[model samples]
Target: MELPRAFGLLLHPTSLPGPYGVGVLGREARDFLRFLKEAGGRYWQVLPLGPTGYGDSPYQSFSAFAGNPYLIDLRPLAERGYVRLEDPGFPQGRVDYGLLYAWKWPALKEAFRGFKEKASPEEREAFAAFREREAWWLEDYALFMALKGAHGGLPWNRWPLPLRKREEKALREAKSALAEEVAFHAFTQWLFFRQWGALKAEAEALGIRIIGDMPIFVAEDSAEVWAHPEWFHLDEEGRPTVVAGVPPDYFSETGQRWGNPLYRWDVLEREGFSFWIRRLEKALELFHLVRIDHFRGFEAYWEIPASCPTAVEGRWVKAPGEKLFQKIQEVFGEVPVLAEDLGVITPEVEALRDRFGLPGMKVLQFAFDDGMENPFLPHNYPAHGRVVVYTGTHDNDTTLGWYRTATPHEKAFMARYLADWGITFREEEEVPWALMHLGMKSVARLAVYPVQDVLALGSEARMNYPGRPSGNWAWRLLPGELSPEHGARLRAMAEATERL
Candidate 1:
């Protein structure tokens, strides 16, 4: 959908500064909302909030519906006398996911025990209401998580045959056997939603809207896939027969073997698209606007055989986009969605995006190499403000980092382009803001810069490297880093561009 001319920062909640190893939904979150307002930001964009699994990447979550328990602030529980920490020792600079995974759950369990025994009647009623309201997805997710733990953290396929296949008798027995674990899982979700809802309310009060991400595909090991095998192209043994990925592209020579199970579109269409409708409904409840990652996948996607080691062996497969979107529009009228129409986009994909009037994205970093004809260049963007412009995204290097490694010719091209637009830099240090200013002045409806660019941070603060499997999503903002000076600079730029 079209958006007002706006400016914002793309800082994942995990990177927000806090006393805990990672950022959280607490005082720090509220403070960040205030900071966004100070900077004249209308949007606060974040990566997926789902519980990360395996590589500590939000994209590869254990469940599409569950919140990351690690993000739930423990201090509130301690202050309320529900739990006490004898030694709250975690790394101060970045997320110690190892430590969080080891300690956070046990702490939350203690808090859950206290909550069950001492919560006031009103709080208890709220919890029960939450359980009832979310029973559609919550029951399956909680049971899936509990069963995963029971099977020593193996994928659902590795679980006993009856459990893997979800036999009714086995599920009944497992629920009886693991009732407490299931309850604990549900309790964590309750806490997450409660805290998130409060944070969202505060943000809205500050005139800031949240933009949350929704990946196009689910992890093969996710609870959604485990619970609904009919919705995916899976073998009788519950393994993906075909997986999702892109062919060789800018990110890789062999391309990325994403290893997500391909959706059975025919089956989803037959089901009246209830899953997509409910998923979007839940996302809309948590966010004002949702950015759908890999929007091209809705029109068509790369399908790789499960046996393929790389994405080189993939083929393009058509998806039922027209029907799916028709169902979505029927259920939720005029939903505000931002299409992540990056990478190797096709005409068909653009057609689908325009059909729905969904805004796509343009990255400044991708503009310099291809000269004036580059579609990412501001002059090439649609004049009607049907695009979101960015200096960089989570997968790209920070602006400062990218410039440092850029070729002299590439750097000169950027400088020349900026000069043509009346933006100039006297020193290398001025590069990040220059690019950010370029983005702000673009015709695109919205401009989003990563928090690192606002701080002029170098390579060390880069959020993620596209092809790297690990060592990504670990960067965190240090406490007191986003000073008033940064906000003033950003506000001035936003005002200059009529984005305030």
Candidate 2:
């Protein structure tokens, strides 16, 4: 959907500064919202909020609908006398997920026990009502998580046959057997939603809209896949037969084998795209605008054999983008959406995006190295499409980091390009603000920059490396790093550019 002329900061909730090992939906989130509103930001763009799976990437999520329980603050539970809070011995910088999970998960369980024993009657009824209200997906999700924990965290496909096949009788028996575990899982989800709703209300009161990210595919091991195997291209045994990925590209000869299960468009269409609709319904409830990641996949996607060792062996296949979006538009009626139409974009993909009036993305880091004709360059953006501009994104290095590692050719091109705009900066440290200036002054409807660049951090603060498996998604803001000075600078830029 088309967006208003606005600007904002890009920061996942996990990156917020807090006493916990990881950022939580507590005082810090509200503080950040206040900070953004004070800075005259109309939007707050964040990565996918789903509970991260094996790789700690938000893209690989356990469930499309559940929040990361790790992001639920324990302080509130302690204050309510549900559990006693203790320092997890976490340092003040990046998150240590391993230790965070170990220490945090058990504390949550203790809170659950305390609730079971002493929670107020009104609170108990509210939790019960929440479970009943969300049972459409929550029942299966809670069961799936409980079963996974019971099986030592194996993928659902590795579970015993009765469970893997989702036999009705077996499910009934397992529900009876794992009742408490299921309840605990559901409780965590309820807690997450409760705290998140409070934070969202605060943002609303301040007139700041949040943009939530949604990936185009679900991980093979996700609750969505486990609960609805019929919606994907899977074998009789519930294993993916063909998976999704992009073909070989300029960045890598081998390409990326994301291994997310490909959707069976025929099945989805036959059922009126309920699965996708439900996902969007959930996203819309939580975010003001939803940014669909890897949006080109809706037009057509790369299909790789499940057994393929690399993405080199893949073929392009057509998908039902028009029909799916038509259905979404029919239901939601001109919803707010931003499309991540990057990678090997085809004319057909552009057609689908333009047909629905969806604004795609442009990253400034990709601008200068290419010639002036490069579509990534702000001047080259088509007037018809209201594209969203980014100084750099989570996957790319921070702008200063990019300058530090840039080739001589790229640097020379950058210098020439800025000079053409009558913009000049000497030190490499000034690169981020220069690009931020360009984005603010651009005609794009929405502009965003990562918090890292706001702090002028280097590569050490990079959030993710697309191909890297570990040491990603661990960056966080230390306390007092982002001050009113940062907000003042951003507000001044926004005002000068008419973005305020």
lDDT of each: 0.89, 0.89
Please give each candidate's TM-score.
Answer: 0.98, 0.98
Clashes of 1: 0
lDDT string, candidate 2, 1-500, tens digits: 55678899999988999986989999888888888888899898889887776778888889988888889998988888899877869876798888887898899999999999889999999999999999999998999999999999999999999999899999999999999999999999999999988888998999999999988998888888988988999998988888888888787789888889999999999999999999999998889989998899888899999899889889999889999999999999875778898766899989998998988999989887768898888788878639889989999988899999898888899888888877889888888998898888888988888999989999988999877868799999988788999999999989998998
lDDT of 1 by residue, 1-500 (tens): 75899998899988989875789999888888898899999999999999887788888888888898888988878887888865468766577777778888789899988888888899889989999999989999999999998989999988999999999999999999999999889999999999999999999999999999989898889888989999999999999989998899765899888898988999888899878888888999899989999889999999999999999999999999888887788788885789999877999999998998889999999898866898999999987888889999999888889999988878999999999999999877789999999988889989998999898888888888866766788889888899999999999999999998
Off by over 4 Å in 2: none
Q: What RMSD does each model have against the real structure?
A: 1.3, 1.1
What candidate 1 gets wrong by more than 4 Å, as runs, is 86-88, 249-251
